[PDB]
Design a protein around this ligand. Structure first.
Ligand SMILES: Cc1cn([C@H]2C[C@H](OP(=O)(O)O)[C@@H](COP(=O)(O)O)O2)c(=O)[nH]c1=O
Length: 136
């Protein structure tokens, strides 16, 4: 039997937080806009939108260390954005948004679904707790 490589975390530097599910980072010396895998936040004009933007922003702006983890599948979306799990001092931004009820699990493609179960677990806790998007 042979294996493939285990996902891994690569460092990157904050350029700018964009919105609840998009951050721009300096990655190997070039800017790349990253779309968070497996999540969707409300838009900035919808309810909870500003809160989702602010959450992501604080998390990445406060971080000493930001890391990018690509999944096993597609690395870019149709609009050119990198698709990744983003970590701020070892805490996954994708997961923290879902746990807070500021993102739903969404855009789940089987090619790129490594942390699906971890996020669904977060979503189930946020729904039990009636947070934000689940409050009604
Ligand atoms: C998470 C994710 C989003 N996307 C695309 C689908 C959505 O475009 P379409 O609606 O044109 O299909 C877009 C949503 O981004 P935002 O939620 O940032 O607006 O991100 C991917 O293509 N793959 C993914 O894994």
């Amino acid at each position: 039997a042979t294996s493939t490589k285990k996902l891994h975390k690569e460092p990157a530097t904050l350029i700018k937080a964009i919105d609840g599910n998009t951050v721009k980072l300096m990655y190997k010396g070039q800017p790349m806009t990253f779309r968070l895998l497996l999540v969707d936040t409300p838009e900035f004009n919808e309810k909870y939108g500003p809160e989702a933007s602010a959450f992501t922003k604080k998390m990445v702006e406060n971080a000493k260390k930001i890391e990018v983890e690509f999944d096993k599948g597609q690395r870019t979306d149709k609009y050119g954005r990198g698709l990744a799990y983003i970590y701020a001092d070892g805490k996954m931004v994708n997961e923290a948004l879902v746990r807070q009820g500021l993102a739903k699990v969404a855009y789940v493609y089987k090619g790129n679904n490594t942390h699906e179960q971890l996020l669904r677990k977060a979503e189930a806790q946020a729904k039990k707790e009636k947070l934000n998007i689940w409050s009604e």
